[PDB]
Amino acid sequence: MKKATCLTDDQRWQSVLARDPNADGEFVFAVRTTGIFCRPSCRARHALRENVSFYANASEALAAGFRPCKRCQPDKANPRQHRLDKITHACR
Ligand SMILES: [Zn+2]
């Protein structure tokens, strides 16, 4: 008719680069550098598409035995306590 099946891994992960669910409203992504399997909108400084694994449902990435994020669950070396955004601190 118009299109056979889904287009490309690029439309998929582009759905990631953006924010809100573009193609697969429920698809899940597993970056094995932060050890997190989560839905598309992980905003906090998120690893690349270089070690990342995609699925239709999190029941798979769980059947994998990975970390279920449905609450873009944050974590930077104690976020509340410490910080230092840059490395220009000596005076003042
Ligand atoms: Zn998340």
Coordinates of N, CA and C and ligand atoms in Angstrom, one line a residue:
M1 N 0.8 -1.2 0.0 CA 0.0 0.0 0.0 C 0.9 1.2 0.0
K2 N 1.3 1.7 1.3 CA 2.2 2.9 1.5 C 3.6 2.5 1.9
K3 N 3.6 1.8 3.3 CA 4.9 1.3 3.8 C 4.7 -0.1 4.3
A4 N 5.8 -1.0 4.0 CA 5.8 -2.4 4.4 C 5.7 -2.5 5.9
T5 N 7.0 -2.6 6.6 CA 7.1 -2.6 8.0 C 7.7 -1.3 8.5
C6 N 8.0 -1.2 10.0 CA 8.8 -0.1 10.5 C 9.9 0.4 9.6
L7 N 10.3 1.8 9.7 CA 11.3 2.4 8.8 C 12.7 1.9 9.1
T8 N 13.3 2.6 10.2 CA 14.8 2.4 10.5 C 15.1 2.6 12.0
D9 N 16.3 1.8 12.5 CA 16.8 2.1 13.9 C 17.0 3.5 14.1
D10 N 17.1 4.4 12.9 CA 17.4 5.8 13.1 C 16.2 6.6 13.5
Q11 N 14.9 6.2 13.0 CA 13.6 6.8 13.4 C 13.4 6.4 14.9
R12 N 13.6 5.0 15.3 CA 13.6 4.5 16.6 C 14.3 5.5 17.6
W13 N 15.8 5.4 17.4 CA 16.7 6.1 18.4 C 16.5 7.6 18.3
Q14 N 16.1 8.2 17.0 CA 15.8 9.6 16.9 C 14.6 9.9 17.8
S15 N 13.6 8.9 18.0 CA 12.5 9.0 19.0 C 13.2 9.3 20.3
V16 N 14.4 8.6 20.6 CA 15.2 8.9 21.8 C 15.8 10.3 21.8
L17 N 16.6 10.7 20.7 CA 17.4 12.0 20.7 C 16.4 13.1 21.2
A18 N 15.1 13.1 20.5 CA 14.1 14.1 20.8 C 13.8 14.2 22.3
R19 N 12.6 13.4 22.7 CA 12.0 13.6 24.1 C 10.8 12.7 24.3
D20 N 9.5 13.3 23.8 CA 8.3 12.5 23.8 C 8.3 11.4 22.8
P21 N 7.5 10.2 23.1 CA 7.3 9.0 22.1 C 6.9 9.3 20.7
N22 N 7.9 9.3 19.7 CA 7.7 9.8 18.3 C 7.1 8.7 17.5
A23 N 7.8 7.4 17.4 CA 7.3 6.2 16.7 C 6.6 5.3 17.8
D24 N 7.5 4.4 18.5 CA 6.9 3.4 19.4 C 6.7 3.9 20.8
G25 N 5.3 4.3 21.1 CA 4.9 5.0 22.3 C 5.5 4.3 23.6
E26 N 5.8 2.9 23.5 CA 6.2 2.1 24.6 C 7.5 1.5 24.6
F27 N 8.4 1.8 23.4 CA 9.7 1.1 23.3 C 10.7 1.5 24.3
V28 N 11.7 0.5 24.7 CA 12.6 0.7 25.9 C 14.0 0.6 25.4
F29 N 15.1 1.3 26.2 CA 16.5 1.4 25.7 C 17.5 1.1 26.8
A30 N 18.6 0.2 26.4 CA 19.5 -0.3 27.5 C 20.9 0.1 27.1
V31 N 21.4 1.3 27.9 CA 22.8 1.7 27.8 C 23.6 1.0 28.9
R32 N 24.6 0.0 28.4 CA 25.3 -0.8 29.4 C 26.5 -0.2 30.0
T33 N 26.6 1.3 29.9 CA 27.7 2.1 30.5 C 27.3 2.7 31.8
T34 N 25.9 3.1 31.9 CA 25.3 3.6 33.1 C 24.5 2.5 33.8
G35 N 24.4 1.2 33.1 CA 23.7 0.0 33.7 C 22.3 0.4 33.9
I36 N 21.6 1.1 32.9 CA 20.2 1.4 33.0 C 19.4 1.1 31.7
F37 N 18.2 0.3 31.9 CA 17.2 0.0 30.8 C 16.0 0.8 31.1
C38 N 15.7 2.0 30.2 CA 14.6 2.9 30.6 C 13.8 3.3 29.3
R39 N 12.5 4.0 29.6 CA 11.7 4.5 28.4 C 12.3 5.8 28.0
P40 N 12.4 6.0 26.5 CA 13.0 7.2 25.7 C 13.4 8.5 26.3
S41 N 12.7 9.1 27.5 CA 13.0 10.5 27.9 C 13.9 10.6 29.1
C42 N 15.2 9.7 29.2 CA 16.2 9.9 30.3 C 16.9 11.2 30.0
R43 N 16.6 12.4 30.8 CA 17.1 13.8 30.5 C 18.5 14.0 31.0
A44 N 18.7 13.7 32.5 CA 20.0 13.7 33.1 C 21.0 13.1 32.1
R45 N 22.4 13.8 32.2 CA 23.4 13.5 31.3 C 23.5 12.0 30.9
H46 N 22.8 11.6 29.7 CA 22.6 10.2 29.4 C 23.7 9.7 28.4
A47 N 24.3 8.4 28.7 CA 25.2 7.8 27.7 C 24.7 7.8 26.3
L48 N 25.7 7.4 25.3 CA 25.4 7.6 23.9 C 24.5 6.4 23.3
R49 N 24.3 6.4 21.9 CA 23.7 5.3 21.2 C 24.7 4.2 20.8
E50 N 26.0 4.3 21.5 CA 27.1 3.5 21.1 C 27.2 2.1 21.7
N51 N 26.4 1.9 23.0 CA 26.5 0.6 23.7 C 25.1 0.3 24.1
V52 N 24.0 0.9 23.3 CA 22.6 1.0 23.7 C 21.8 -0.1 23.1
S53 N 20.7 -0.7 23.8 CA 19.9 -1.9 23.3 C 18.4 -1.6 23.4
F54 N 17.7 -1.7 22.1 CA 16.3 -1.3 22.1 C 15.3 -2.5 22.1
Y55 N 14.0 -2.3 22.7 CA 13.0 -3.3 22.7 C 11.6 -2.7 22.5
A56 N 10.4 -3.5 22.2 CA 9.1 -3.0 22.2 C 8.5 -2.7 23.6
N57 N 8.8 -3.8 24.6 CA 8.4 -3.7 25.9 C 9.5 -3.9 26.9
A58 N 9.4 -3.3 28.2 CA 10.4 -3.4 29.3 C 10.5 -4.8 29.8
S59 N 9.3 -5.7 29.5 CA 9.2 -7.1 30.0 C 10.4 -7.9 29.4
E60 N 10.9 -7.5 28.1 CA 12.1 -8.0 27.5 C 13.4 -7.6 28.3
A61 N 13.7 -6.2 28.3 CA 14.9 -5.7 28.9 C 15.0 -6.2 30.4
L62 N 13.7 -6.5 31.1 CA 13.7 -7.2 32.4 C 14.1 -8.6 32.3
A63 N 13.4 -9.4 31.2 CA 13.8 -10.8 30.9 C 15.3 -10.9 30.6
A64 N 15.9 -9.6 30.2 CA 17.4 -9.5 30.1 C 18.0 -9.6 31.5
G65 N 17.3 -8.7 32.5 CA 17.8 -8.7 33.9 C 18.5 -7.4 34.2
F66 N 17.9 -6.2 33.6 CA 18.5 -4.9 33.6 C 17.8 -4.0 34.5
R67 N 18.2 -2.6 34.5 CA 17.7 -1.6 35.5 C 16.5 -0.8 35.0
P68 N 15.2 -1.2 35.4 CA 13.9 -0.6 35.0 C 13.6 0.8 35.5
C69 N 13.9 1.9 34.5 CA 13.6 3.3 34.8 C 12.3 3.7 34.1
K70 N 11.2 4.0 35.0 CA 9.9 4.6 34.5 C 9.7 6.0 35.3
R71 N 10.9 6.6 35.7 CA 10.9 7.8 36.6 C 12.2 8.6 36.4
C72 N 12.8 8.7 35.1 CA 14.1 9.1 34.7 C 14.9 9.4 35.9
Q73 N 15.0 8.2 36.8 CA 15.8 8.0 38.0 C 17.2 8.5 37.9
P74 N 17.5 9.8 38.5 CA 18.8 10.5 38.5 C 19.9 9.8 39.4
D75 N 21.2 10.3 39.3 CA 22.3 9.9 40.2 C 23.7 10.3 39.7
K76 N 24.2 11.5 40.3 CA 25.6 12.0 40.0 C 26.3 12.2 41.3
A77 N 27.5 11.3 41.5 CA 28.3 11.2 42.7 C 27.7 12.0 43.9
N78 N 26.5 11.5 44.5 CA 25.8 12.3 45.5 C 25.5 13.7 45.0
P79 N 24.2 13.8 44.2 CA 23.7 15.1 43.5 C 23.4 16.2 44.5
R80 N 22.6 15.9 45.7 CA 22.4 16.9 46.7 C 23.7 17.4 47.3
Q81 N 24.5 16.4 48.1 CA 25.7 16.8 48.8 C 26.6 17.7 47.9
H82 N 27.5 16.9 47.0 CA 28.5 17.6 46.2 C 27.9 18.2 44.9
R83 N 28.9 18.7 43.9 CA 28.4 19.3 42.7 C 29.6 19.7 41.8
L84 N 30.1 21.1 41.9 CA 31.1 21.6 41.0 C 30.8 21.3 39.6
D85 N 30.0 22.4 38.8 CA 29.6 22.2 37.5 C 30.8 22.3 36.5
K86 N 31.8 23.3 36.8 CA 33.0 23.5 36.0 C 34.2 23.2 36.9
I87 N 35.5 23.6 36.3 CA 36.8 23.4 37.0 C 37.6 24.7 37.1
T88 N 36.8 26.0 37.2 CA 37.4 27.3 37.4 C 37.0 27.9 38.7
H89 N 37.6 27.2 39.9 CA 37.4 27.7 41.3 C 38.8 27.7 42.0
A90 N 39.3 29.0 42.4 CA 40.5 29.2 43.1 C 40.4 30.3 44.1
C91 N 39.7 31.6 43.7 CA 39.5 32.7 44.6 C 38.1 33.1 44.6
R92 N 37.8 34.3 45.3 CA 36.4 34.7 45.6 C 35.6 33.7 46.3
Ligands
ZN1 ZN 14.6 7.2 32.4

